[PDB]
């Protein structure tokens, strides 16, 4: 049996908050190559911390190695994107890739075909901002992406943990003073945004395995190779 299912909702929140990866910096007028260089290097360093974070998501360690690999291979770009969208919340019109790398959609135009993804990312960030997404809700949503996005391409343990995270999100909204109706309405609104995050990841992935330019690391290459 898994220890994650005995956690209370406050225990689930604190554990997810404590597991949060650090905010990373990039190197200190962008061409297309230099732009993709910065983003590829930043994504590469973030992947290492994401794996550590995943090991600390309650219930993830109870899965086999094969299952852990499958979930992270399926979800890694979604997880980077919701992280980026979260950090950018307080910067309307801009994507905060790192504290020293805050970009607008015009800079996104430097890489042909990225401005479409940039605009989708900006739209999601502003949606989160208008909803006043709280950090406790954010770590729940990001854990849901990890456990859900590959569960149907393999299951019972995972769905029990996902239920625990649903309970936790409702608990957070009840604690925030929302009525019953507002609780399930907000729950649905947040979970529907996960479908758009899946869409962004798919469209982004499609571009990443068309341009084979920048020195993408071997780990990042094997993570990309899983979607071809």
């Amino acid at each position: 049996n898994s220890l994650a299912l005995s956690l209370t909702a406050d225990q689930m929140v604190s554990a997810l908050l404590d597991a949060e990866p650090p905010i990373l910096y990039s190197e200190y007028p962008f061409s297309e190559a230099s732009m993709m260089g910065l983003l590829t290097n930043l994504a590469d360093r973030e992947l290492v911390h994401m794996i550590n974070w995943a090991k600390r998501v309650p219930g993830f360690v109870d899965l086999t190695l094969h299952d852990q690999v499958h979930l992270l291979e399926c979800a890694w770009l979604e997880i980077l994107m919701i992280g980026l969208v979260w950090r950018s919340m307080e910067h309307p019109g801009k994507l905060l890739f790192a504290p020293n790398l805050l970009l607008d959609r015009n800079q996104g135009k430097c890489v042909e075909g990225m401005v479409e993804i940039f605009d989708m990312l900006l739209a999601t960030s502003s949606r989160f901002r208008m909803m006043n997404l709280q950090g406790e809700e954010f770590v729940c949503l990001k854990s849901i992406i990890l456990l859900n996005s590959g569960v149907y391409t393999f299951k019972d343990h995972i769905h029990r943990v996902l239920d625990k995270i649903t309970d936790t999100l409702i608990h957070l909204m009840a604690k925030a003073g929302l009525t019953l109706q507002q609780q399930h309405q907000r729950l649905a609104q947040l979970l529907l945004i996960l479908s758009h995050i899946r869409h962004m990841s798919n469209k982004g992935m499609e571009h990443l395995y068309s341009m084979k330019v920048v020195p993408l690391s071997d780990l990042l290459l094997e993570m990309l190779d899983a979607h071809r």
């Binding site: 290492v48 794996i51 090991k55 190695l65 852990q68 690999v69 992270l72 291979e73 071997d218 780990l219 094997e222 993570m223």
Partner: peptide, 10 residues
């Protein structure tokens, strides 16, 4: 095999 294997065990 996969670098992801080593990173999930270390």
């Amino acid at each position: 095999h996969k670098i992801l294997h080593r990173l999930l065990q270390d």
